[PDB]
Structure formats: C-alpha cells, structure tokens
Design an enzyme around this catalytic site. Structure first.
Site, PDB file in Angstrom:
ATOM      1  N   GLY A   1       0.780  -1.226   0.000  1.00 31.99           N
ATOM      2  CA  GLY A   1       0.000   0.000   0.000  1.00 31.99           C
ATOM      3  C   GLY A   1       0.810   1.272   0.000  1.00 31.99           C
TER       4      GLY A   1
ATOM      5  N   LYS B   1       3.754   4.116  -0.613  1.00 36.96           N
ATOM      6  CA  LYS B   1       4.244   4.763  -1.815  1.00 36.96           C
ATOM      7  C   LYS B   1       5.604   5.240  -1.370  1.00 36.96           C
ATOM      8  CE  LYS B   1      -0.296   6.631  -2.829  1.00 36.96           C
ATOM      9  NZ  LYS B   1      -1.090   7.863  -3.152  1.00 36.96           N
ATOM     10  N   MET B   2       6.612   4.687  -2.025  1.00 37.78           N
ATOM     11  CA  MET B   2       7.990   4.974  -1.712  1.00 37.78           C
ATOM     12  C   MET B   2       8.555   6.079  -2.573  1.00 37.78           C
ATOM     13  SD  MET B   2      11.216   2.302  -1.356  1.00 37.78           S
ATOM     14  CE  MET B   2      12.881   2.744  -1.617  1.00 37.78           C
TER      15      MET B   2
ATOM     16  N   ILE C   1      10.531   8.263  -4.886  1.00 40.98           N
ATOM     17  CA  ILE C   1      11.380   7.861  -6.007  1.00 40.98           C
ATOM     18  C   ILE C   1      12.860   8.209  -5.869  1.00 40.98           C
ATOM     19  CG2 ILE C   1      11.078   9.892  -7.491  1.00 40.98           C
ATOM     20  CD1 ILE C   1      10.603   7.979  -9.803  1.00 40.98           C
TER      21      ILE C   1
ATOM     22  N   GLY D   1      15.906   9.233  -2.932  1.00 40.83           N
ATOM     23  CA  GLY D   1      16.219   9.224  -1.521  1.00 40.83           C
ATOM     24  C   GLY D   1      17.590   9.823  -1.293  1.00 40.83           C
TER      25      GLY D   1
ATOM     26  N   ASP E   1      18.209   7.003   3.076  1.00 41.62           N
ATOM     27  CA  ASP E   1      18.669   5.609   3.105  1.00 41.62           C
ATOM     28  C   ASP E   1      19.712   5.434   4.164  1.00 41.62           C
ATOM     29  OD1 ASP E   1      18.680   2.918   1.515  1.00 41.62           O
ATOM     30  OD2 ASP E   1      20.794   3.375   1.872  1.00 41.62           O
TER      31      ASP E   1
ATOM     32  N   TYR F   1      26.857   1.830   8.440  1.00 42.54           N
ATOM     33  CA  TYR F   1      27.337   3.125   7.969  1.00 42.54           C
ATOM     34  C   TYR F   1      27.916   3.872   9.171  1.00 42.54           C
ATOM     35  CZ  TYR F   1      24.597   2.174   3.783  1.00 42.54           C
ATOM     36  OH  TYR F   1      24.086   1.619   2.643  1.00 42.54           O
TER      37      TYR F   1
ATOM     38  N   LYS G   1      18.803  -1.093   7.361  1.00 43.00           N
ATOM     39  CA  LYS G   1      19.110  -2.458   6.991  1.00 43.00           C
ATOM     40  C   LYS G   1      19.752  -3.272   8.102  1.00 43.00           C
ATOM     41  CE  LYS G   1      20.829  -0.122   3.769  1.00 43.00           C
ATOM     42  NZ  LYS G   1      21.430   0.519   2.596  1.00 43.00           N
TER      43      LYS G   1
ATOM     44  N   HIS H   1      20.458  -6.199   4.719  1.00 41.81           N
ATOM     45  CA  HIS H   1      21.562  -5.622   3.940  1.00 41.81           C
ATOM     46  C   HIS H   1      22.175  -6.555   2.881  1.00 41.81           C
ATOM     47  CE1 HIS H   1      24.315  -1.889   4.382  1.00 41.81           C
ATOM     48  NE2 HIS H   1      24.382  -2.342   3.144  1.00 41.81           N
TER      49      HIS H   1
HETATM   50  N1  LIG Z   1      22.454  -1.634   0.006  1.00 43.81           N
HETATM   51  C1  LIG Z   1      23.734  -1.470  -0.252  1.00 43.81           C
HETATM   52  O1  LIG Z   1      24.416  -2.472  -0.306  1.00 43.81           O
HETATM   53  C2  LIG Z   1      24.256  -0.165  -0.582  1.00 43.81           C
HETATM   54  C3  LIG Z   1      25.558  -0.048  -1.030  1.00 43.81           C
HETATM   55  C4  LIG Z   1      26.102   1.142  -1.349  1.00 43.81           C
HETATM   56  C5  LIG Z   1      25.350   2.272  -1.236  1.00 43.81           C
HETATM   57  N2  LIG Z   1      24.046   2.228  -0.808  1.00 43.81           N
HETATM   58  C6  LIG Z   1      23.217   3.419  -0.665  1.00 43.81           C
HETATM   59  O2  LIG Z   1      23.251   4.159  -1.882  1.00 43.81           O
HETATM   60  C7  LIG Z   1      23.752   5.464  -1.636  1.00 43.81           C
HETATM   61  C8  LIG Z   1      24.458   5.979  -2.891  1.00 43.81           C
HETATM   62  O3  LIG Z   1      25.594   5.158  -3.307  1.00 43.81           O
HETATM   63  P1  LIG Z   1      27.106   5.587  -2.932  1.00 43.81           P
HETATM   64  O4  LIG Z   1      27.231   6.279  -1.648  1.00 43.81           O
HETATM   65  O5  LIG Z   1      27.938   4.306  -3.088  1.00 43.81           O
HETATM   66  O6  LIG Z   1      27.664   6.601  -4.040  1.00 43.81           O
HETATM   67  P2  LIG Z   1      27.031   7.560  -5.133  1.00 43.81           P
HETATM   68  O7  LIG Z   1      25.772   8.049  -4.712  1.00 43.81           O
HETATM   69  O8  LIG Z   1      27.121   6.895  -6.438  1.00 43.81           O
HETATM   70  O9  LIG Z   1      28.152   8.723  -5.162  1.00 43.81           O
HETATM   71  C9  LIG Z   1      28.569   9.425  -3.983  1.00 43.81           C
HETATM   72  C10 LIG Z   1      29.652  10.329  -4.419  1.00 43.81           C
HETATM   73  O10 LIG Z   1      29.104  11.200  -5.388  1.00 43.81           O
HETATM   74  C11 LIG Z   1      29.349  12.561  -5.017  1.00 43.81           C
HETATM   75  N3  LIG Z   1      28.183  13.358  -5.508  1.00 43.81           N
HETATM   76  C12 LIG Z   1      26.856  13.356  -5.083  1.00 43.81           C
HETATM   77  N4  LIG Z   1      26.115  14.181  -5.754  1.00 43.81           N
HETATM   78  C13 LIG Z   1      26.975  14.757  -6.659  1.00 43.81           C
HETATM   79  C14 LIG Z   1      26.776  15.710  -7.649  1.00 43.81           C
HETATM   80  N5  LIG Z   1      25.585  16.252  -7.874  1.00 43.81           N
HETATM   81  N6  LIG Z   1      27.858  16.082  -8.401  1.00 43.81           N
HETATM   82  C15 LIG Z   1      29.072  15.529  -8.175  1.00 43.81           C
HETATM   83  N7  LIG Z   1      29.338  14.617  -7.253  1.00 43.81           N
HETATM   84  C16 LIG Z   1      28.228  14.273  -6.522  1.00 43.81           C
HETATM   85  C17 LIG Z   1      29.528  12.511  -3.540  1.00 43.81           C
HETATM   86  O11 LIG Z   1      30.323  13.647  -3.075  1.00 43.81           O
HETATM   87  P3  LIG Z   1      29.944  14.539  -1.794  1.00 43.81           P
HETATM   88  O12 LIG Z   1      29.235  13.724  -0.791  1.00 43.81           O
HETATM   89  O13 LIG Z   1      31.277  14.986  -1.407  1.00 43.81           O
HETATM   90  O14 LIG Z   1      29.149  15.606  -2.379  1.00 43.81           O
HETATM   91  C18 LIG Z   1      30.229  11.187  -3.352  1.00 43.81           C
HETATM   92  O15 LIG Z   1      31.669  11.289  -3.604  1.00 43.81           O
HETATM   93  C19 LIG Z   1      24.667   5.251  -0.475  1.00 43.81           C
HETATM   94  O16 LIG Z   1      25.089   6.447   0.157  1.00 43.81           O
HETATM   95  C20 LIG Z   1      23.854   4.364   0.409  1.00 43.81           C
HETATM   96  O17 LIG Z   1      22.939   5.120   1.168  1.00 43.81           O
HETATM   97  C21 LIG Z   1      23.448   1.018  -0.472  1.00 43.81           C
HETATM   98  N1  LIG Z   2      32.380  -3.740  -0.359  1.00 40.78           N
HETATM   99  C1  LIG Z   2      31.078  -3.802  -0.130  1.00 40.78           C
HETATM  100  O1  LIG Z   2      30.338  -4.458  -0.840  1.00 40.78           O
HETATM  101  C2  LIG Z   2      30.509  -3.015   1.079  1.00 40.78           C
HETATM  102  C3  LIG Z   2      29.617  -1.823   0.577  1.00 40.78           C
HETATM  103  C4  LIG Z   2      28.895  -1.108   1.763  1.00 40.78           C
HETATM  104  N2  LIG Z   2      28.288   0.154   1.376  1.00 40.78           N
HETATM  105  C5  LIG Z   2      26.981   0.124   1.569  1.00 40.78           C
HETATM  106  O2  LIG Z   2      26.228   1.060   1.335  1.00 40.78           O
HETATM  107  N3  LIG Z   2      26.608  -1.043   2.052  1.00 40.78           N
HETATM  108  C6  LIG Z   2      27.645  -1.872   2.220  1.00 40.78           C
HETATM  109  O3  LIG Z   2      27.624  -3.027   2.660  1.00 40.78           O
HETATM  110  C7  LIG Z   2      29.866  -0.949   2.892  1.00 40.78           C
HETATM  111  C8  LIG Z   2      29.544  -0.071   3.929  1.00 40.78           C
HETATM  112  C9  LIG Z   2      30.415   0.106   4.975  1.00 40.78           C
HETATM  113  F1  LIG Z   2      30.084   0.947   5.949  1.00 40.78           F
HETATM  114  C10 LIG Z   2      31.631  -0.568   5.037  1.00 40.78           C
HETATM  115  C11 LIG Z   2      31.969  -1.444   3.996  1.00 40.78           C
HETATM  116  C12 LIG Z   2      31.097  -1.634   2.920  1.00 40.78           C
HETATM  117  O4  LIG Z   2      31.529  -2.509   1.934  1.00 40.78           O
END
Ligand SMILES: NC(=O)c1ccc[n+]([C@@H]2O[C@H](COP(=O)([O-])OP(=O)(O)OC[C@H]3O[C@@H](n4cnc5c(N)ncnc54)[C@H](OP(=O)(O)O)[C@@H]3O)[C@@H](O)[C@H]2O)c1
Ligand SMILES: NC(=O)[C@@H]1C[C@]2(NC(=O)NC2=O)c2cc(F)ccc2O1
Ligand SMILES: NC(=O)c1ccc[n+]([C@@H]2O[C@H](COP(=O)([O-])OP(=O)(O)OC[C@H]3O[C@@H](n4cnc5c(N)ncnc54)[C@H](OP(=O)(O)O)[C@@H]3O)[C@@H](O)[C@H]2O)c1
Ligand SMILES: NC(=O)[C@@H]1C[C@]2(NC(=O)NC2=O)c2cc(F)ccc2O1
Lengths: 315, 315
Positions: free
Chosen positions: B9, B11-12, B14, B16, B43, B48, B77, B110
């Site tokens: 139900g 609505k997430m 688009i 984050g 997120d 983290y 997560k 996660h």
């Molecule tokens: N479930 C998982 O396993 C998982 C894994 C990885 C990530 N995530 C989630 O996804 C989010 C996004 O992925 P991510 O953190 O790996 O990296 P990302 O969003 O691909 O990139 C982050 C980088 O991009 C820069 N950036 C952001 N907006 C920008 C813009 N408009 N212009 C230029 N540079 C910009 C940031 O710099 P500044 O911050 O210095 O501006 C930072 O160096 C994460 O933060 C996390 O919450 C989930």
């Molecule tokens: N190498 C990987 O796949 C993961 C990525 C990852 N970032 C993210 O958002 N989820 C993850 O689990 C992560 C986050 C950390 F805080 C520390 C290590 C780390 O490594």
C-alpha cells in the site's frame, strides 16, 4: 502486482469487470458475484444502457457491508453525444445518479469522435454514417478537467485515442490534468505494441478491453476468428491447466495492462479471477505477441469518415 | 512517477538520500538540508555508523514542524552479523533508538550473507576472508516478518539478493510478508537488465545504489572508470543543459527504479533533486543502457567464498 498507481496517486486495480452487453436483470447479480469474488474494479458506460442496474448492485453490497466505497474503483465514460462542453457536466451527473454515487473514481472520454447531441446514441445520416458534432477534442478535455476541480471525478482518462490525439491533449496550453488512462482494445490479434509503449512512455495507464475477443458483439460474423477457440492458445492453456479465458487475461496483466473481461455468468466471473497464481512464460508472451493481425473487434465503422476517427493512423 | 507503490500500500519516494560514507560531522546538516530541499526518503544502515547523527536531523526538523513523520520514508538495513534469528529483533531496535524513531518504513536485510555474531562488522578469519554463520535465510526472513506483526517496521525487504535468493523467499512455506523492495547496484556500467525485470515481474520494487558510480569509495583505483567524467554521458547532460549527476539520477527513474544518490554537500543535495523537470529520450536511454560493462563498485570481495555470496549467479 494487483493494482497500478495512477497519476492522481490513485491505486487502480489491475483487473475489472466489464458490463457492456450485460443485460439489466443479469448485470445486477453479476456485479454482486464479482464483488463477492474479489473484483473491486467495475467498468461502466452510459451507452451500455445498464449503469442504473449496476448501481443497485454496488448499493446492495455496501448495505450488506462487504465493501466500503473507497474499496471499489468505479469507471464510467462520456458518450460521444455529450462532447459539447455545457453537456459534459450534465452527463457525468446522470452516470453518478444512475450508479447512485457521489463521485466516479475515473471518467473517460469514450471516443475521440463527438456526435450530434440528441436522444439517440448513434445519430445516423442518410447514408448510414454518423452525424458529427462541431466539437473539438480540446474543449472537451477542458470540460472534463472541471469535473475534477469540482470533486465529481477523482481521475480523467481517454478511450480509443491514437497517439496523435493523445499527444495534443498532452500539449494543450494551460493543461491542468493529464490523461490518467487510455483504455484500448487489446488481445493477441490486436497487440497494440506501439501505442502501449507510447502511453507508458508518457506515464499513462493502458487498460485492455475486449480481452477475450468480445464473442457476443452484435456485429460478429461467423467467419471472423475466435480467440477463445484458437487451437494455438488452447495449446498454451494446456500447459498451465488454466482455460483459454484465463490465459487471455494473464497476457495483458504481464504486459502491465488493466484487463476488463466481461461476463454475467457467476461461474465465469470466478474463473476469470483465478489468474494471479501462474505465469505465462517469456516464450508464451512472445508466442501470443506474434498472433497480431491488427484485427479490430470495435472499430466504430459508422464513423470511418469522421474528422476524428482514431484508426486511420498506424497507432 | 515521483513516488512508487509498494506491495503493502505504501508509496515509496522515487529519490532518496544516501548516507554511506557521510561523516557524522556532516550527516546531520546533510539530512536537514535534504529535508528542506524536499527529500522525503533517507537511506540508512547500521554499518554506515552515522545512524545516530541522521536521527538528530530528523528529530530537529520534525520539531520545527517542517515535515511530519507521516511524510518521511526512513529506511534501514540488518547487518550481516544479526542474521541469527535471535539477534534480528534487537538489531532493529538498536536502529530505532539511534534514529530516534518509533518505527521504520522499510527495513532490508543488507546482504544475503550473514557473518558470525560479534562486535565486528567483518569477522575476518586468518586469510582475510570473513567468518559466516550457520544461519538459515528464511529463518531470518521469519524474524523480519515479526517486526511487521510487532509494528516495528511498516515494510520489509532485501538488498544484494540474486534471483535465486529472492525466489527462495517467494516460495517459503507459509510466507506472511513478501519482499517489498530489492536494493541492488545499478548504473550505466552495470545496467542490471535481467534481475531488474525478474524483480518488477514479481511486483518487487528495485532501488538502485551507487547511481553515480560511488566516486568516494575507499577502494577506488586510478584505472577504474568514472561515470561522471564519461564524455559520452557528459554529452547527454550537455544536451539537456543539466549535469552528469542529474542525467545519472534521471536514468533509473525512467526505468521505474527509485534511486538513492549520496552527498553531504548542500549544493549537490539541491542539485540532485532537480531531476523531475526534464526527460531523457528513447535514444538517450538506449545510449546509457549500452554502456554496461558488468562493472561493480560493491562486490563484498571478502565474501567471495561465502556459501551465499550473491554475485556468482548471472543474475
Ligand atoms: N544496500 C547497499 O548495499 C548499498 C551499497 C552502497 C550504497 N548504498 C546506498 O546508496 C547510496 C548511494 O551510493 P554511494 O554512496 O555508493 O555513491 P554515489 O551516490 O554513487 O556517489 C557518492 C559520491 O558522489 C558525489 N556526488 C553526489 N552528488 C553529486 C553531484 N551532484 N555532483 C558531483 N558529485 C556528486 C559525492 O560527493 P559529496 O558527498 O562529497 O558531495 C560522493 O563522492 C549510499 O550512500 C547508500 O545510502 C546502499
Ligand atoms: N564492499 C562492499 O560491498 C561493502 C559496501 C557497503 N556500502 C553500503 O552502502 N553497504 C555496504 O555493505 C559498505 C559499507 C560500509 F560501511 C563498510 C563497507 C562496505 O563494503
Ligand atoms: N472504452 C471502450 O471504447 C470500450 C469498448 C469496448 C469494450 N469496453 C469495455 O471492455 C469490456 C470487455 O469487452 P467485451 O465485453 O467486448 O468482451 P469480452 O470480455 O472480450 O468477451 C465477452 C464475452 O466473453 C464471454 N466470457 C467471459 N468470460 C468467459 C470465460 N471465462 N469463458 C468463456 N466465455 C467467457 C462472455 O460471456 P457471458 O457474458 O455470457 O459470460 C461474453 O460472451 C466491455 O464490457 C466494456 O466494459 C470499453
Ligand atoms: N463498434 C464500436 O466501436 C462500438 C463499441 C462499443 N462498445 C463499447 O464498450 N464502447 C463502444 O463504443 C459500443 C457500445 C454500444 F453500447 C453500442 C455500440 C458500440 O459500438
């Protein structure tokens, strides 16, 4: 996925009951069984000549407490004869009065072709062709947006609009509300690939009508193909042990369309609902997609020479 | 759209705000600014390690009556170490106390690879490989489902799960709750075409992560590619006068994936939100999709030998 999110944020159930051709005495028990079965989507229209009877059914189920109004998705349509702005509101008001409601979840322009205002739905001329209305498609949408602003319809859509017509509603200067849905004919013989793709690219929801080929249409000829009786599809129903009718409904569902099969048979209304527990394979999808004939069941022949006839384009 | 519909139900939102790598010394202003700008989806994760500083930003803007809890969509997560059915419940609670929230809108496992319970997020054996737990994924799913009955989290989901790992939860005997979302890596270099469609077929929303390629990742080498510098992608941006990062965030939204860009800079946070006022063309899309080179930013290399390491399967 059981429901699609529309533009107005409304969640539209992916399967609905059709009421075109459902006789007055038979439509009532049919809407009832549908609701009891699980159908919360019903498809109505003024020209179907039974909205009033459909309404009595919904009233009975609300009284019986099987459903709260905000649980059903009632759709209706504006007949080509009330295309003229000042006539729109009044027509909406008759659909609501008949269905006995306060508001319709979605109200659609039934056809891009507006007819001469009069008692009769198909005001034919001396040669068997429809006597066209003066009306342009834009003022009508403008007439339709006023209903949303008045809180009489939650959403507004289009039905049988080709991509060109759709486009102009989209670019009309000062547009308030975007077409929520575009209900179009769709089954293996009329796969509507391009149009579905366009509508979806523009964020519009496509609702497939005549999913089972509309066996009972008044003009059917005993020489046209019959989808329910196509051996190649009986072939696929075999592997899933579902009926052709069930495989003919799963099809649009997996292509992300709302499907609205019609039926007044209690047994069938149920048969048509058991389609959430199986999946046509990718090849099954591919197979049924190749059955395209660009074969239309509802082509509004009396309006082939109307300025706004929808089917002369490729899509 | 601007908000997607989950299989419960909800609505997430688009778009984050990501929080991996955001130091605690800046994640609070980061979130606050994000909220002001208009984001209603943050997120978060336990690993983290800034989940406490995020909670503050939330707590603060909530008291200024700038937004209601009703409106936000906070996500967290379960770390690999709390995969044991007994630890789940408390791990979740720990998240709610840090974030200072009474419930979560979406709680994800996660990774499909749990480690041995301990004070260490990555229990490396001698060889640097990580120590796993003899736990049963459905059993963890069981604990997650209880968070929903308990009222702790409004929805549950998975992250980094391949189609076989997902499918095993979809067939789980007596399954109460079904994967709402699957957060996986997605960007032009890893387009995720087979898994993404597998998922959307199941009515499972996808959340693309590292949408900009993760330029801040600790393990970046000079030879690695740079999505933001890619002259081809720079050309698409150029055309729309928007910027690379904006193109790159638009990319997933036109495929029906929610995207979560991370940034602790108030100037980029604002920029990244300005992606609803333009549209990538059918070609732009085809262009970006062909860039895929099966390149991953997050491969959890210390777990390539884990029974459940997710990236051996094609998808
Ligand atoms: N479930 C998982 O396993 C998982 C894994 C990885 C990530 N995530 C989630 O996804 C989010 C996004 O992925 P991510 O953190 O790996 O990296 P990302 O969003 O691909 O990139 C982050 C980088 O991009 C820069 N950036 C952001 N907006 C920008 C813009 N408009 N212009 C230029 N540079 C910009 C940031 O710099 P500044 O911050 O210095 O501006 C930072 O160096 C994460 O933060 C996390 O919450 C989930
Ligand atoms: N190498 C990987 O796949 C993961 C990525 C990852 N970032 C993210 O958002 N989820 C993850 O689990 C992560 C986050 C950390 F805080 C520390 C290590 C780390 O490594
Ligand atoms: N917007 C528009 O322009 C437009 C145009 C056309 C249609 N529509 C909508 O779409 C709906 C569906 O199209 P339709 O009525 O033309 O035809 P349809 O649903 O394709 O076919 C109806 C016929 O199929 C039979 N049937 C239904 N389920 C069956 C089953 N399980 N097994 C065997 N037979 C079955 C019905 O029999 P019984 O009734 O005897 O059970 C009836 O004869 C319409 O009713 C209407 O609501 C909208
Ligand atoms: N031939 C056509 O295209 C239309 C189809 C159509 N059915 C339908 O649901 N919408 C229509 O307009 C219809 C309905 C009627 F009540 C009478 C005629 C009629 O003909």
């Amino acid at each position: 996925a059981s429901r699609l999110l529309l533009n107005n944020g409304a969640k539209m159930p992916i399967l609905g009951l059709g009421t075109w051709k459902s006789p007055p005495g038979q439509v009532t028990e049919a809407v009832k069984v549908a609701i009891d079965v699980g159908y919360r989507h019903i498809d109505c229209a003024h020209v179907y000549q039974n909205e009033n009877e459909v309404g009595v059914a919904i009233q009975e189920k609300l009284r019986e407490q099987v459903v709260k109004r905000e649980e059903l998705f009632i759709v209706s349509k504006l007949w080509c004869t009330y295309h003229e702005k000042g006539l729109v509101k009044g027509a909406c008001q008759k659909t609501l009065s008949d269905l006995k409601l306060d508001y319709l979840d979605l109200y659609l322009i039934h056809w891009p072709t507006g007819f001469k205002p009069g008692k009769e739905f198909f005001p034919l001329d001396e040669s068997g062709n429809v006597v066209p209305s003066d009306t342009n498609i834009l003022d009508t949408w403008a007439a339709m947006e006023e209903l949303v602003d008045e809180g009489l319809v939650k959403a507004i859509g289009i039905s049988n609009f080709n991509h060109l017509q759709v486009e102009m509603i989209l670019n009309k200067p000062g547009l308030k509300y975007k077409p929520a849905v575009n209900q179009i004919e769709c089954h293996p013989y009329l796969t509507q690939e391009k149009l579905i793709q366009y509508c979806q690219s523009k964020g519009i929801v496509v609702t497939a009508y005549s999913p089972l080929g509309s066996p009972d249409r008044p003009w059917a000829k005993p020489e046209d193909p019959s989808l329910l009786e196509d051996p190649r599809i009986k072939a696929i129903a075999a592997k899933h042990n579902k009926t052709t009718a069930q495989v003919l409904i799963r099809f649009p569902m997996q292509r992300n369309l709302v499907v609205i099969p019609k039926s007044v048979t209690p047994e069938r209304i149920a048969e048509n609902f058991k389609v959430f527990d199986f999946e046509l394979s990718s090849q099954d999808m591919t197979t049924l997609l190749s059955y395209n004939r660009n074969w239309r069941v509802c082509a509004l022949l009396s309006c082939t020479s109307h300025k706004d006839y929808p089917f002369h384009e490729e899509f």
